[PDB]
Amino acid sequence: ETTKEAYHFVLVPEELDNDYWRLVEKGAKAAAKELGVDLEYIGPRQANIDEHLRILKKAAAAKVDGIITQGLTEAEFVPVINEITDKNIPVVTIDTDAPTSRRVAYVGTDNYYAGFLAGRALAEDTKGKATVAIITGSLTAAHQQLRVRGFEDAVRQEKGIRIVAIEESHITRVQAAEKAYTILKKHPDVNAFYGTSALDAIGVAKVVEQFHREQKTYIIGFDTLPETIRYLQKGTIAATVVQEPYEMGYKAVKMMAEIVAGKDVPVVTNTETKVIRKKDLPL
Ligand SMILES: OC[C@H]1O[C@@H](O)[C@H](O)[C@@H](O)[C@H]1O
Numbered sequence: 001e002t003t004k005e006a007y008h009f010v011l012v013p014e015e016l017d018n019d020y021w022r023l024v025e026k027g028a029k030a031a032a033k034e035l036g037v038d039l040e041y042i043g044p045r046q047a048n049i050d051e052h053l054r055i056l057k058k059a060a061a062a063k064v065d066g067i068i069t070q071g072l073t074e075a076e077f078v079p080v081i082n083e084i085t086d087k088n089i090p091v092v093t094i095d096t097d098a099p100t101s102r103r104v105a106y107v108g109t110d111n112y113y114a115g116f117l118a119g120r121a122l123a124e125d126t127k128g129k130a131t132v133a134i135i136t137g138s139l140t141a142a143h144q145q146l147r148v149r150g151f152e153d154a155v156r157q158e159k160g161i162r163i164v165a166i167e168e169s170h171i172t173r174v175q176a177a178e179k180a181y182t183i184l185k186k187h188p189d190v191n192a193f194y195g196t197s198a199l200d201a202i203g204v205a206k207v208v209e210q211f212h213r214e215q216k217t218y219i220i221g222f223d224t225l226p227e228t229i230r231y232l233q234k235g236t237i238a239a240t241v242v243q244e245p246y247e248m249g250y251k252a253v254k255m256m257a258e259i260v261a262g263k264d265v266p267v268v269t270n271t272e273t274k275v276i277r278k279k280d281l282p283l
Contacts, residue, residue: 006038009256010059011094011249012052012069013043014141018171019225020198020245024095027249028068035257040064047171049073049140053080060084066256067091071098071106072141090259094252095245096143097268104259107248108143110270114222115147118194118241119154121275122161122220125238129160130192130218133183135204137171137197147196147222147241164190169200176203184211195221202227205236220275224283232278244271 011028013021025041032039042059044051052072057080059067067084071077071093081091081101090104097106122130134151137144148166155161165183169176176199183190184207193208195201201221208217220239221228231237248271255265276283 001038003038006036007065007257007260008038008040008062009066009068009253010040010042010064011252012055012059012067013041014052014070014072014095015047015171016041016043016045018047018198020223023245024249027246027251028253029249031250031253035253037065037253037257039253047138049076053077056080056084060087060089064089065260068094068252068256070094070096070141070143071101071103072096074098074100074142077101090256092252092256092259094248096141098142099268105255105265105267105269107252107255107269108271109243109248109273111143111146112150114241114243114273115150115196116154117150117273117275118147118220118222118239119151121239122151122192122194122218123155123158125220125277126161126192126218128158130162131187131189132161132163132192132194133165133167133180133187133190134163135167135169135176135179135193135195135200137200138168139166144196151194151196169195169197169203171197171199173199173203173206176200177207178203180204180207190217191215192218193220195219198223198225198228201237201240202231205231209236224276229281229283233281235278239275239277242272242274242276247271
């Protein structure tokens, strides 16, 4: 660590203590241990574009050997990824891609297609009939935009599915729940929710269970954090989109070491995504 012996790679999460990003860090740290590189996990305490960009520039100013980060937005992150690359520091994107930038490689879900699968799933389980509200991590983050947009394309040929609300959770359980509650009071006809980040469906499920209505509410969310699996087992959540956070962190560090060695790697490595339901539990 406090040695120049080792390569220094930085992994920047969307939010430092977000549960999903700590899983990504587990994968990255394990790859780093196997390779004998120093992996520094450095990120905003509270998700924030400007703070995220400040940490990227600070790591590049410390002349680290590689930087792994989301290309969180196209407008702000492409020029910064490019300027870092031009200072001879390779950039690997993780979890969210910036495909027009000069990042060397991406490891993460195909986010558009993840949302499309969620849209297919909701249309199948509701037989094409649903009054849908969407809770998304943010309206500006690229992976959130793609998961919403893929969902919308997938349900567009279902005349009986209508989206009546889209709200931001800022990837916390508490804002997801707050938004779910206000959606239900302004739109009492909502009977389906779609969450596009790891804590959204958890926030919705808490609010749905506090009503304990007879007429059920369909919830499809993202990722497989323990609370999500529990709600899926309870039947409160109907489905969720799988990602491979540990694997993208592990593979991003392995790719970075290959790049530092002068070796080619694929431009895009899409880790597995698929919709699972209660019938797919155990795992
Ligand atoms: O809980 C928030 C997290 O949700 C995940 O679905 C997403 O891939 C991560 O980037 C992060 O936004």
